[PDB]
Each structure stands twice: as structure tokens, then as C-alpha cells.
Design a protein around this nucleic acid. Structure first.
Ligand SMILES: *[PH](O)(O)OC[C@H]1O[C@@H](n2cnc3c(N)ncnc32)[C@H](O)[C@@H]1N
Lengths: 85, 182, 136, 49
RNA sequence: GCCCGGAUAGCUCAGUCGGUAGAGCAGGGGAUUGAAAAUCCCCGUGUCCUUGGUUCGAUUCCGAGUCCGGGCACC
RNA sequence: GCCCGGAUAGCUCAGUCGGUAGAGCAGGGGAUUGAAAAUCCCCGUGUCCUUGGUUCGAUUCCGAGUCCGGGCACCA
RNA sequence: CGCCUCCUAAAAGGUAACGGAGGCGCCCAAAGGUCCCCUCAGGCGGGACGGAAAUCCGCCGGAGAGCGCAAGGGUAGAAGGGGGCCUGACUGCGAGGCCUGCAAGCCGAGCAGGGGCGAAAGCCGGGCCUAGUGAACCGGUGGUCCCGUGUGGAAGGGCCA
């Protein structure tokens, strides 16, 4: 008396908003304070000279510097801002 | 009292060079002397809090300077694997001389003293020649009388020695404070 | 089969090549053109062999009951959480080092395999130890 | 309503500053500190329900 | 495709909110009977499911889990 | 969110218009006890929720605080 | 049927699916500041009331114990464990950037008033961080002391909190 399918909605209600962060400011490019560079939800980044780590593990330009990519090899990743020009 | 003080002083001072070169021939170093002595006893869970905690007091006290308050069962022994922080650190880490009139009074003057208190213990320290042996019953009246029926018993102390390897350490407190049988 | 005390529910699907080769006794069954193979079928061979071999002196192993295959429903219409666990098996694809001993000493072992796999489920080949292998 | 209720700071009749706060542990106990725009900084006090 | 151990004495179920556990039935020992019932006196019983955590203290308050339950499984 | 009531013995509750704290039940103790009772006498404990002021003093009087109980009204 | 975390986004970033998984719609009055100290679990060997597992001694160790809460990142060159003193979990504010079409949400040197931790070289405009969140209307209260429908006031009302 009525063979038509059957209920079946087990459920995987999963979700994660999109995001940002990362290696976000190109070699050498003109990098001014206020200008953010590389955000890290960790510590792949050590705020070297003029590199200001914001109250969030966010690499922000502390000075008018040329984009200073300072991978200090093994010490870890070290970010730096070079004395303008 | 200060009697046995001068005593340990000498026992060791001389015995030291004694065996020191008797076998050493290093440079009369901690080959093999003894330094500082911590003492530990029957953990707070042995508690009643106010009562036997204060008794732990009396005892730690007249014994070597330090005597218990009221807190001995937190994060509780509870049921088997039931325990949290560790607010029951009741011990004396006193460091030197006091310690020696102690090697004295203690080992050499209270050693055998109560119920078959013989001492026929194998490899006393042996865990690197530094201590081992704590006794499982107080020096009864190392002072005080009935100031608690069960009062205390789980007693065990430890010395910080340099009597490096055993045989050596053995020479050390063996003749210095008595090596309990085989 | 055996893929006991797993950890997750299901895998996914692909295939292409891997890392099976060696030897391990000199009575070898190597796949060639497969993919996953029923842990069962597997046991099948296991049997086949075991039995043939005067029924005693042990064979060895090879792959494992590896993944969880799901036909999900039972035959419904499709949209389940794709749930349902159901058939568990091997994931071997480039002629793989499938290793089986016993002490047959011969084309007897041969037969054993012959059927075991002839059976099993693919274009495959068999042999022995042909170019040793040096490790650290 | 939970052991989390909102209060705010006011200062010796010469201002009031805000901020929420709680209820739990030491409950009422509510002096605190803070600084109003009164004078240049100044105690304040806090309390205020 | 849910509702609460929906727990705690041998059982059926109270009680707590963390201090208190209880009752009925069962049961053990005497009494009545010629002997059993019934009836009459006396009595003992609890990891309060396991579990970590908090707290000075947890059966009780949180966190995880096991079991037994309850709403659909069918248009 | 206002508007009323209470806070007392272990339980439920009396209580000068400021001078004492009292019932009822539970709990315990003896006589009675085929017997269960009912009877029958006897007790047990109180910052009278807390903090101050009124008064020679205050369970009481007033303010304030916490709590529980009632009620009544809204809620973008 | 809102948000955080991991996979698939396939290597920039970034994307469905009735695709996998799994948490939050608390608080922490001091896990909020800074100054001074310290420094894991676990392995082994030796020990009172032990007695698989406390407490103490003796070694060993890319740190896998740890950080309210889930994941992931980080990370004891401690954000982690302990002591002292204290409120900036400040108002005025910010240049200049993350992402985003909207609004959002988010990162922040430095100038001012004003303090607090050291003597100070300086850190502090909440926490170790990524979830604990809600326009607009409407109306309340603590201001303010701007407006008032002739003028004085006021019902009432504008901006602040
Ligand atoms: P009935 O007793 O016929 O059993 C199910 C029948 O109903 C139809 N059906 C069930 N569920 C449906 C949804 N969600 N959409 C459309 N039709 C649906 C089936 O055809 C089945 N025969």
C-alpha cells in the first residue's frame, strides 16, 4: 500500500567562515607603517626591526621601510622594515 | 646535645680523610662525603586536617624545625585515579650542619630504638649512593610523649651525597653512621 | 578481514600506483592491474592457499582490509549523508608485492596461488625472489 | 541573570564611567578605581548599580 | 527518529539542593500452633551507575561515557 | 519592573501596641501492655534571618540588606 | 537554517554538496598590569602511612605534558608554574593597512591629558590568540544644562553615557 522511497537525512551540519591572514606583503615593495604585512595565527613570524606584532599575531608596518623579507633561516621567519631611503 | 654535635663533627671529619686515602688516592674529594638532607613523611592524605595535621606539626617541629597546619587531602586520594593539584608538600629541606648533628642524633643516637628496631637492610641507598632508608615508625620519643595516639609513623628522609658509586658511598655512611647488616 | 578498531568512517576514491615489490619467503603472488580488493575475497585466497597446502605450514600476508566501502542506502534514491559502512578491503594497484609462504616447495604453491588469485579479482602475476634488496 | 549581571562605575558625584562586570565570586565587593573625566583622572571609585 | 537512570538496600520505588538515605516487601532470630500460614515482638542493609573536575567537604554541581527507557524509520 | 506577607524549636507555625518566647507534630523516657491503639504522666532546641538607630531596656518599633513566598503589569 | 576550528580550496587566496567531522550564544572580580623568581609529562633506580598512580631522594628528556572552554595555529628564546606591588578591562584619538561591492568586523605605531610595574632601557588603552554576537525603530535610566513653537519657566524635548 504505497512503495515510494523512505526517509533518510542523517546530518552533517558543518561550517567554517571564510578567512584571511598569511604572507601578504610583497618583497621590497614600498612598505609604510599602518600598512599591514603578514598576519599569523601562530609564530612563524618574529617582529624584527620596525616590525610590529599587533595584539593578535599580526605583522604590521612600524616604519617607513622597504619590504624587508628576513627569513632568518632556522631561527625562524624574521620580518624586517628597511630604513626608507 | 651540642655534645653529640661536636660528636658528628669529629666522627666524620676524621673518618673522612681516614678511608679517604685508605682507598681513594684521588685528591681527598667528596670521595665520598655527604651534603644537605631533605626529609619527607606520610603525605597529607594521612590527614584529619586540623588534628593529625597539627601533629605532623609538633613532629616536623621538635624534630628539625618546621611544624604542620590544617590541609591534608585536596584533589583527594579520592577513588583510585581521582586526584587534582598536590597541596600536601610536607617536608624539611634543611641544608647542612643542623643536618649533621642530625646524622648524629638520628642515625647514631636513635637508630635502634623501639620494637625489634634491628636493621638488617640490603643495599640501603644504592640508587647512586645518596641515601635510602626512612624507617616505618618514628624515633618514638625523639622527644614528645602521647601528643596523639597514632600520631605519626610513615617516616622517611634522604641525604644529598657525593658518595658517588655505591661500594664507595658504602664506605661512607657504613663506617660513618652504621651499615645495617647484609 | 581485519581493519579493526579503525578511527574514521570513510575514505574516497582514485587509484594509480604505489610501493609493493620485495619478496619475503619466495612464494609470491603479486597483483598487477587492480585497485581495492575485498578483504573477503582476500580471505578467500587465504583459504584457498591454506587449504591446498596439506592444510598447515603457514602462508604469510600482504595487503590489508584497509578502507570502508559504502553503497550507502540499500537501494533508495540518493542523498543520504552518504553514511553507512559496509564492505572493507585492500587498496593495491600497481602489480603489488602480495606475499604467501607455507613450504609447498613447488608448482604446488603455484596452484595454490593459481586459484587463489585467478579468483581474486584481476589481471595479475606471480613468482619468487629475483633481485634481493639492501637496506640500512 | 546568571551569576553574570551588569554593573558600572560612577565616581564621587563628579562623573560616571561604565563597563559591565559580573556577580560570581566576591559578589558585591565593588570599590575598584578607574578615573573619570573629572579633574585630570581622579579616583572615581566605581561601585554604582 | 525522540523524553528524563528515568540511578541509590536483595526487589519496587521516595529523599538531598552536596551534609541528611529512606520506606514497603524480602530476609535472619525468638513467640503463638500438634505443624505450617497468618499474626506478635527483636534485628542488619547501602562506591546513591562508571567517570574525571570544582569544593574544605559531592549521592547531590559541572564535563565525558555505559545501560535501560521514551518520538518518528513511515509520504 | 511595581504592589502586598512572612524570616521563631528539627517540621508547621503562635506572639505585650517595648518587660515571658509559646503551641501542635516529629524525637526521646517510664507505667500499660495476648494487643495495637488509645489512653497516661515527662521532657528536648531557640543572635526570634542580618546590620544599625529609638528606649532604661525591644521577638515586638523604624530604616536598610539578603532570602523565600504572594500577587499585578508590560516585553522592541 | 548565526559563529569558531579541521578536511575537500587541488598547494596564493579563495568555492558548493541532504559532503565529512566537531565545538559556542560561558566568563575569568581577578587567568585584567608590570617587576622578581621558577621551568613539563613521561622513562628509569631508590625509598614512611606507599604500596598499578601520591610524597621525597637519585639520574634520563625537538618540550610528545601546558595555556577555563572544540579544533587548529602557536608556542616553555614559556603565551606556561610561583611571589610583590597595581589598575589603561584609561578618555581624547589615531596615521596608515587586513579582508568587503553594501554595512560590517578586524590590525595599529605614534601625539595629548592620566595615571601604575622598575631605579630605570620600557610594558599597560583586558586576557595567549581565531567563536561568548544582533541594524533600525520604540521606549528607560545616570547626564547635560543645547532647544522651547510671544516672554519668564515647563510638559515636553536635541547630543553624551
Ligand atoms: P506512500 O504510502 O505512497 O509511500 C511513499 C510514497 O509517497 C511519495 N513520496 C514520499 N516522499 C516524497 C517526497 N518527499 N516528495 C515527493 N513524493 C514523495 C513516493 O512516490 C512514494 N511512492
Amino acid at each position: 500500500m504505497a512503495h515510494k522511497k523512505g526517509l533518510g537525512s542523517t546530518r552533517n551540519g558543518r561550517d567554517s567562515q571564510a578567512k584571511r591572514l598569511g604572507v601578504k606583503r610583497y618583497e621590497g615593495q614600498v612598505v609604510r607603517a599602518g600598512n599591514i604585512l603578514v598576519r599569523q595565527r601562530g609564530t612563524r613570524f618574529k617582529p624584527g626591526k620596525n616590525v610590529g606584532m599587533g595584539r593578535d599575531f599580526t605583522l604590521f608596518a612600524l616604519v617607513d621601510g622597504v619590504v624587508e623579507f628576513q627569513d632568518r633561516g632556522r631561527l625562524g621567519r624574521y620580518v624586517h622594515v628597511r630604513p626608507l631611503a | 646535645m651540642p655534645l653529640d654535635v661536636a660528636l658528628k663533627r669529629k666522627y666524620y671529619e676524621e673518618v673522612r680523610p681516614e678511608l679517604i686515602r685508605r682507598f681513594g688516592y684521588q685528591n681527598v674529594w667528596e670521595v665520598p662525603r655527604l651534603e644537605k638532607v631533605v626529609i619527607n613523611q606520610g603525605l597529607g592524605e594521612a590527614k584529619e586536617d586540623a588534628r593529625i595535621l597539627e601533629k605532623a606539626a609538633q613532629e616536623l617541629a621538635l624534630i628539625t624545625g618546621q611544624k604542620p597546619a590544617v590541609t591534608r587531602a585536596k584533589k583527594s586520594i579520592s577513588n583510585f585515579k581521582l586526584r587534582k593539584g598536590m597541596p600536601i608538600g610536607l617536608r624539611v629541606t634543611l641544608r647542612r650542619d643542623r643536618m649533621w648533628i642530625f646524622l648524629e642524633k638520628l642515625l647514631n643516637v636513635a637508630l635502634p630504638r623501639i620494637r625489634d628496631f634491628r636493621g638488617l637492610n640490603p643495599n640501603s641507598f644504592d640508587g647512586r649512593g645518596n641515601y635510602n632508608l626512612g624507617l616505618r615508625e618514628q624515633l618514638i620519643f625523639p622527644e614528645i610523649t602521647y601528643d596523639m595516639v597514632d600520631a605519626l609513623r610513615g617516616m622517611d628522609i634522604a641525604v644529598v651525597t657525593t658518595a658517588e658509586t655505591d661500594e664507595e658511598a658504602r664506605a661512607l655512611l657504613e663506617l660513618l653512621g652504621f651499615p645495617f647488616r647484609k | 578481514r581485519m581493519k579493526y578498531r579503525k578511527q574514521q568512517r570513510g575514505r574516497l576514491k582514485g587509484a594509480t600506483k604505489g610501493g609493493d615489490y620485495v619478496a619475503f619467503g619466495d612464494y609470491g603472488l603479486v597483483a598487477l592491474e587492480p585497485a581495492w580488493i575485498t578483504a573477503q575475497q582476500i580471505e578467500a585466497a587465504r583459504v584457498a592457499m591454506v587449504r591446498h597446502f596439506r592444510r598447515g605450514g603457514k602462508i604469510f600476508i600482504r595487503i590489508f582490509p584497509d578502507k570502508p566501502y559504502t553503497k550507502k542506502p540499500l537501494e533508495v534514491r540518493m542523498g543520504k549523508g552518504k553514511g553507512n559502512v559496509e564492505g572493507y578491503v585492500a587498496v593495491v594497484k600497481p602489480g603489488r608485492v602480495m606475499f604467501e609462504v607455507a613450504g609447498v616447495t613447488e608448482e604446488q604453491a603455484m596452484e595454490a596461488l593459481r586459484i587463489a588469485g585467478h579468483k581474486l579479482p584481476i589481471k595479475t602475476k606471480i613468482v619468487r625472489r629475483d633481485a634481493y634488496d639492501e637496506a640500512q | 541573570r546568571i551569576k553574570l549581571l551588569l554593573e558600572c562605575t560612577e565616581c564621587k558625584r563628579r562623573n560616571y564611567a561604565t563597563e559591565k562586570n559580573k556577580r560570581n565570586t566576591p559578589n558585591k565587593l565593588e570599590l575598584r578605581k578607574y578615573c573619570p573625566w573629572c579633574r585630570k583622572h581622579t579616583v572615581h571609585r566605581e561601585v554604582k548599580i
